[PDB]
Design a protein around this ligand. Structure first.
Ligand SMILES: CCNC1=N[C@@H]2[C@@H](O)[C@H](O)[C@@H](CO)O[C@@H]2S1
Ligand SMILES: [N+]
Length: 648
């Protein structure tokens, strides 16, 4: 499975061996980045004036003069040919030659190559990643990894703009990077250049920018410092701000100044990009002058970013026609998936889908805003690279599978199992959801429908669920121990623990449904209770961020089914045995609508609360915004949002 799939491919059902002895033609005149790749592939072999001809070069090179007609007349285009007599790797331009090589590397398997002819080129001009999320910025080693991933997948763009980098956003956007951070950035650029990726350095000055000379010069002085570190594409971001910095006329004037006094004055600047304050349709004023002012006043070479009809949305024909009419150019898409910075307790490891596959002509660029989990984001990133290169041939599920097998070949099926039950976002203020656990959803649905109704469930459905839980535990245990991609395993570990606990709880609950006798039922019930407590422990100790602390997994279908089945069987047991077992499904150590614990807060889900111990009280916040600082007073009982903060 070639990824991205090429525009045109003709395969002969013949394979040839990779020439053990070969004549290379054009090694001295082709893209050195492409030639490096080729010479690594041809490692172990040796060249001569004998052997298979291999021709590498860009249109215009002597090496590829016979193939000039077959080379696509497109930026980043290439012609690739393999037959018994010779190999051709001919780019329309230097980056095209590199992309030819990236396709060639995927064709090569077990020292053999298929007989193929390929004509290829991207449908979207700029394709890549914006590191543009709130939360812990990717680590240096993670970025190094990413840039290499992008080159392999023909993504040409890496926009650097972590909202939490103080030298990117306010107030320190004015300050040059300290020496250590500067030397790292410089290495990120060298690496990007070697992989044919434009490193795009963004700045985010809008929250405290003054529309005066001092700040304009400070901004240009910063761009200059970044240029000295080797940066050659630049962006100015005005997203998620208030106040003077939201002025569309001043924004355009600043971007035009940067364009005229800096971008068009240097010998070798490439992209100049801005993101607006009104960056999706819902946050745009139909009756306001913001987007029309930007569209009219911004110089036509400047790109304008857009997230769709909502902050989190997929791109539609009608959606993009709507933006393009106002900005008078094709939107450069900022796609908010798999970014999880507003559902920080979820991993979003599902396929990439939802974007119209017929609108390449209506976009200048397509970039994904990913999770703070860099390795985990590669599933979506690989799929986005495939989508933006050849949207006409984009295959959601095949590309997801390909990505997983690329990222974790040693445990691909186990990562598939984990990813397919870790795709949805749960309820959220952005209203964006993804499908999850689709395969078992019917069997789950019928089981619970019947079971809740004294109608007898299908045996095959009970077995499907059983099989699912078994497969979940195998996957969790194997992923935990996997050392092929240690950084990936580190990222997902807390969710993996939680996913295993979930599957164990599922199995125990199914044993309760079968329930041979009263004694056995009670043992399974007590085990479930202890498993609930364990999941609570994980949720309270892992991923304790300020915003959505903890660890949620398999939330759309599997956990609800388990929880509901549990409540149901406990109800039936209590009826049958005149008992009073507690049917509640989430462990809660405090007593009182469910209570919840978030960090050092104890809250009622929006009379009297009794904590498991005496704590120093911090304050209470009630909203029917009422508040009272508790001054460290010892508290166990509180009687009257409804949130209690304690020292913990
Ligand atoms: C032109 C779009 N700019 C945007 N800025 C914010 C980002 O930093 C967040 O990561 C994203 C998802 O929460 O939400 C918005 S979209
Ligand atoms: N060349």
């Amino acid at each position: 499975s070639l990824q991205p799939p090429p525009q045109q491919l003709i395969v002969q059902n013949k394979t040839i061996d990779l020439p053990a002895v070969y004549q290379l033609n054009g090694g001295e005149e082709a893209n050195p980045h492409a030639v490096k790749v080729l010479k690594e592939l041809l490692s172990g072999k040796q060249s001569s004036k004998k052997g298979m001809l291999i021709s590498i070069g860009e249109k215009g090179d002597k090496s590829v003069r016979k193939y000039s007609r077959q080379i696509p007349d497109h930026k980043e285009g290439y012609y690739l040919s393999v037959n018994e007599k010779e190999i051709v790797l001919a780019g329309n331009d230097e980056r095209g030659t590199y992309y030819a090589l990236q396709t060639f590397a995927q064709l090569l398997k077990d020292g053999k190559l298929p007989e193929v002819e390929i004509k290829d080129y991207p449908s979207v001009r700029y394709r890549g990643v914006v590191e543009g999320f709130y939360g812990t910025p990717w680590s240096h080693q993670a970025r190094l990894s990413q840039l290499k991933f992008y080159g392999k997948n023909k993504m040409n763009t890496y926009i650097y703009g972590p909202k939490d980098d103080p030298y990117h956003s306010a107030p320190n956007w004015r300050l040059p990077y300290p020496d250590k951070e500067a030397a790292q950035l410089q290495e990120l650029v060298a690496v990007a250049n070697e992989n044919e990726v434009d490193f795009v350095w963004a700045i985010h000055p809008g929250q405290d920018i003054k529309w005066n000379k001092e700040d304009r010069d400070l901004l240009l002085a910063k761009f200059e410092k970044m240029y000295q570190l080797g940066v050659r594409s630049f962006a100015v971001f005005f997203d998620d701000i208030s106040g003077e910095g939201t002025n569309p006329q001043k924004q355009a004037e600043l971007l035009n100044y940067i364009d005229e006094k800096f971008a068009q004055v240097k010998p070798d600047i490439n992209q100049l990009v801005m993101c607006p304050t009104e960056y999706n349709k819902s946050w745009s004023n139909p009756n306001g002058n913001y987007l029309t002012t930007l569209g009219d006043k911004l110089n036509p070479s400047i790109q304008i970013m857009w997230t769709g009809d909502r902050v989190i949305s997929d791109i539609t024909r009608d959606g993009i026609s709507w933006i393009n009419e106002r900005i008078k150019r094709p939107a450069y898409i900022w796609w908010n998936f798999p970014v999880s910075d507003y559902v920080r307790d979820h991993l979003l490891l599902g396929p990439v889908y939802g974007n119209d596959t017929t609108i390449a002509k209506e976009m200048s660029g397509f970039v994904t805003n990913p999770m703070e989990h860099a390795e985990s984001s590669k599933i979506a990133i690989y799929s986005v690279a495939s989508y933006a290169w050849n949207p006409a041939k984009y295959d959601t599920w095949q590309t997801w599978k390909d990505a997983i097998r690329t990222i974790l070949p040693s445990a691909a099926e186990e990562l598939e199992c984990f990813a397919m039950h870790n795709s949805d976002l749960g309820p959220n203020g952005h209203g964006y959801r993804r499908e999850e656990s689709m395969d078992i959803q019917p069997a789950a649905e019928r089981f619970l429908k019947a079971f809740k109704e004294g109608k007898n469930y299908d045996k095959a459905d009970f077995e499907t669920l059983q099989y699912t839980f078994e497969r979940m535990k195998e996957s969790a245990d194997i992923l935990l121990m996997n050392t092929e991609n240690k950084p990936l395993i580190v990222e997902i570990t807390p969710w993996v623990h939680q996913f295993k606990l979930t599957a164990e709880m599922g199995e125990e609950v199914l044993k309760m449904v079968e329930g041979r006798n009263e004694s056995y039922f009670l043992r399974k019930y007590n085990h479930v209770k202890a498993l609930q407590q364990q999941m609570f422990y994980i949720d309270q100790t892992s991923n304790q961020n300020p915003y959505q602390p903890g660890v949620k997994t398999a939330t759309r279908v599997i956990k609800p089914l388990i929880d509901r089945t549990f409540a149901t069987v406990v109800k039936f047991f209590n009826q049958k045995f005149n008992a009073h077992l507690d049917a509640t499904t989430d462990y809660m150590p405090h007593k009182m609508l469910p209570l919840q614990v978030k960090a050092n807060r104890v809250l009622i889900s929006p009379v009297e609360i009794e904590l498991d111990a005496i704590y120093p009280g911090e304050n209470i916040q009630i909203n029917f915004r009422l508040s009272a600082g508790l001054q460290k007073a010892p508290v166990k009982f509180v009687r009257f949002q409804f949130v209690l903060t304690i020292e913990k």
